[PDB]
Design an enzyme around this catalytic site. Structure first.
Site, PDB file in Angstrom:
ATOM      1  N   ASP A  37       0.818  -1.230   0.000  1.00  0.00           N
ATOM      2  CA  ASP A  37       0.000   0.000   0.000  1.00  0.00           C
ATOM      3  C   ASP A  37       0.846   1.270   0.000  1.00  0.00           C
ATOM      4  O   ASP A  37       1.363   1.664   1.049  1.00  0.00           O
ATOM      5  CB  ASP A  37      -0.898   0.005   1.235  1.00  0.00           C
ATOM      6  CG  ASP A  37      -1.902   1.159   1.257  1.00  0.00           C
ATOM      7  OD1 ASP A  37      -2.146   1.827   0.234  1.00  0.00           O
ATOM      8  OD2 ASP A  37      -2.475   1.385   2.335  1.00  0.00           O
ATOM      9  N   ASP A 221      -1.101   5.549  -5.585  1.00  0.00           N
ATOM     10  CA  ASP A 221      -1.614   4.683  -4.510  1.00  0.00           C
ATOM     11  C   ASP A 221      -1.932   3.241  -4.928  1.00  0.00           C
ATOM     12  O   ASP A 221      -2.917   2.978  -5.628  1.00  0.00           O
ATOM     13  CB  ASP A 221      -2.849   5.335  -3.878  1.00  0.00           C
ATOM     14  CG  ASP A 221      -3.368   4.564  -2.679  1.00  0.00           C
ATOM     15  OD1 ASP A 221      -2.667   3.630  -2.217  1.00  0.00           O
ATOM     16  OD2 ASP A 221      -4.477   4.896  -2.204  1.00  0.00           O
TER      17      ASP A 221
HETATM   18  C1  LIG Z   1      -9.797  -3.351  -2.367  1.00  0.00           C
HETATM   19  C2  LIG Z   1      -8.389  -3.053  -2.837  1.00  0.00           C
HETATM   20  C3  LIG Z   1      -8.064  -3.173  -4.190  1.00  0.00           C
HETATM   21  C4  LIG Z   1      -6.772  -2.885  -4.658  1.00  0.00           C
HETATM   22  C5  LIG Z   1      -6.482  -3.037  -5.912  1.00  0.00           C
HETATM   23  N1  LIG Z   1      -6.288  -3.209  -7.047  1.00  0.00           N
HETATM   24  C6  LIG Z   1      -5.798  -2.492  -3.746  1.00  0.00           C
HETATM   25  N2  LIG Z   1      -6.078  -2.366  -2.435  1.00  0.00           N
HETATM   26  C7  LIG Z   1      -7.302  -2.621  -1.910  1.00  0.00           C
HETATM   27  C8  LIG Z   1      -7.497  -2.447  -0.418  1.00  0.00           C
HETATM   28  O1  LIG Z   1      -8.234  -3.219   0.194  1.00  0.00           O
HETATM   29  N3  LIG Z   1      -6.796  -1.460   0.166  1.00  0.00           N
HETATM   30  C9  LIG Z   1      -6.935  -1.011   1.432  1.00  0.00           C
HETATM   31  C10 LIG Z   1      -7.687  -1.704   2.386  1.00  0.00           C
HETATM   32  C11 LIG Z   1      -7.808  -1.207   3.681  1.00  0.00           C
HETATM   33  C12 LIG Z   1      -7.173  -0.012   4.044  1.00  0.00           C
HETATM   34  F1  LIG Z   1      -7.305   0.438   5.314  1.00  0.00           F
HETATM   35  C13 LIG Z   1      -6.361   0.740   3.026  1.00  0.00           C
HETATM   36  C14 LIG Z   1      -5.650   2.054   3.358  1.00  0.00           C
HETATM   37  C15 LIG Z   1      -4.822   1.890   4.629  1.00  0.00           C
HETATM   38  C16 LIG Z   1      -6.721   3.093   3.672  1.00  0.00           C
HETATM   39  C17 LIG Z   1      -7.383   3.517   2.385  1.00  0.00           C
HETATM   40  C18 LIG Z   1      -6.610   3.531   1.128  1.00  0.00           C
HETATM   41  C19 LIG Z   1      -7.246   3.915  -0.055  1.00  0.00           C
HETATM   42  C20 LIG Z   1      -8.590   4.292  -0.024  1.00  0.00           C
HETATM   43  N4  LIG Z   1      -9.320   4.294   1.118  1.00  0.00           N
HETATM   44  C21 LIG Z   1      -8.803   3.931   2.324  1.00  0.00           C
HETATM   45  F2  LIG Z   1      -9.543   3.934   3.448  1.00  0.00           F
HETATM   46  C22 LIG Z   1      -5.179   3.103   1.200  1.00  0.00           C
HETATM   47  N5  LIG Z   1      -4.374   3.310   0.152  1.00  0.00           N
HETATM   48  N6  LIG Z   1      -4.775   2.533   2.267  1.00  0.00           N
HETATM   49  C23 LIG Z   1      -6.292   0.182   1.752  1.00  0.00           C
END
Ligand SMILES: Cc1cc(C#N)cnc1C(=O)Nc1ccc(F)c([C@]2(C)Cc3c(ccnc3F)C(N)=N2)c1
Length: 378
Positions: A37, A221
């Protein structure tokens, strides 16, 4: 330098559920799959038997574990996680051959955080201390890694879209890209912040004050699926994408991601959809470059659909109150180099990006763009 065969193909995933790397915590090592992430800064892992989890960090089994005797509570708009802070020995089996003592949030309660059916049990925040929780004194994993070993301060990501990829830690692997890397400054070290200076739908400029493109932020991101765009910019953006594709009709809900759109198998009209181009600030005053993605990137297969038998997709461009987010829709087109040492991000055409026989993802420069400093918000 240049090739890191050990680290090639070290990423796995399910379409839409994220990219995860294998990691180990504690002594003896406990193996966990960990979401990669670049939009957050905490190393946080399940530490209790939530029913969705294949496994979780058992602090009691680790001789090298140390309590920081301090909690952390992390709300998101969608759910939350809460944890207990400690440090332990952390390594990456298919990464550099080192072991570091890193901070770990042992997650003890959560809501809407873990995904039912997913194969990861933690998250590796690769962004900077500024946005670490509870505050910037909690040293992110990558900072710890760089301070404690001789790993160069950089990592690169090839997200391939069962999806796969590579996270090359401490370097760049030239087999993962074709052509040249083009670099955009990291504006400020908190998220991986950058500036978009021009947007073209299908070669045609949107002619918005570029300030809007970065209102209030533009970030790279890997923890977001979508290309997320500020509302005002999203409005203009889809207005133009609608027009480029008026050759076929779709309900107004589809453009809002409120409904899927299906076609008969192998019948998606990619060509009725426009290529999208972001121009990014370059390394040199008045110099920019352009990255170009396909509808392959922004129209995303939704596989788990039992009410249908067709090729159903989600429009993966969506509005935002937090700024532009360059998620997996962008990153899957490119090899992305997080050049922390030089405070810049490099883009190149990915050797693995999904492309049809007529159009390909592209990174091109140099272009002349004036007043790029004005495109950043204050
Ligand atoms: C569903 C998903 C799909 C892809 C693909 N292809 C990549 N990642 C995820 C995913 O499940 N990320 C995720 C889950 C919980 C989190 F808590 C975060 C945070 C910490 C928090 C977060 C983020 C982005 C958008 N709003 C959030 F609340 C982010 N970058 N980090 C990310």
């Amino acid at each position: 330098r240049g090739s890191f065969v050990e680290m090639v193909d070290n990423l796995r995933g399910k379409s839409g559920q994220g990219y995860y790397v294998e990691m180990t915590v504690g002594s003896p090592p406990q193996t966990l799959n960990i979401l990669v992430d670049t939009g957050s800064s905490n190393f946080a892992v399940g530490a209790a038997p939530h029913p969705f989890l294949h496994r979780y960090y058992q602090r009691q089994l680790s001789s090298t574990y140390r309590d920081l005797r301090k909690g952390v509570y992390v709300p998101y708009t969608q759910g939350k996680w809460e944890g207990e802070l400690g440090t332990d020995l952390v390594s990456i089996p298919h990464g550099p051959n080192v072991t570091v003592r890193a901070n770990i949030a042992a997650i003890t309660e959560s809501d809407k955080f873990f995904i039912n059916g997913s194969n990861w049990e933690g998250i590796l925040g690769l962004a900077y201390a500024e946005i670490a929780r509870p505050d910037d004194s909690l040293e992110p994993f990558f900072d710890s890694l760089v301070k404690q070993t001789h790993v160069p301060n950089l990592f690169s990501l090839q997200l391939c879209g069962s999806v796969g990829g590579s996270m090359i830690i401490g370097g760049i692997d030239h087999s993962l890209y074709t052509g040249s890397l083009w670099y955009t400054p990291i504006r400020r070290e908190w998220y991986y912040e950058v500036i978009i200076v021009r947007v073209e739908i299908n070669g045609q400029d949107l002619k918005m004050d570029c300030k809007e493109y970065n209102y209030d932020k533009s970030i790279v991101d890997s923890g977001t699926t979508n290309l997320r765009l500020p509302k005002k910019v999203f409005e203009a953006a889809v207005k133009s994408i609608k027009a480029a594709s008026s050759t076929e009709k779709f309900p107004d809900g589809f453009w809002l991601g409120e409904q899927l759109v299906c076609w008969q198998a192998g019948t998606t009209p990619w060509n009725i959809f426009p290529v999208i181009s972001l121009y990014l600030m370059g390394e040199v005053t008045n110099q920019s470059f352009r990255i170009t993605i396909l509808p392959q990137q922004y129209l995303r297969p939704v596989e788990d659909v039992a009410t249908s038998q067709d090729d159903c997709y989600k429009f993966a461009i969506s509005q935002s109150s937090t700024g532009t987010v360059m998620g997996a829709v962008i990153m899957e087109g490119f090899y992305v180099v997080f050049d922390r040492a030089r405070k810049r991000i490099g883009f190149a055409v990915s050797a693995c990006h999904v492309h049809d026989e007529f159009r390909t993802a592209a990174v091109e420069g140099p272009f002349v763009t004036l007043d790029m400093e004005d495109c950043g918000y204050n």
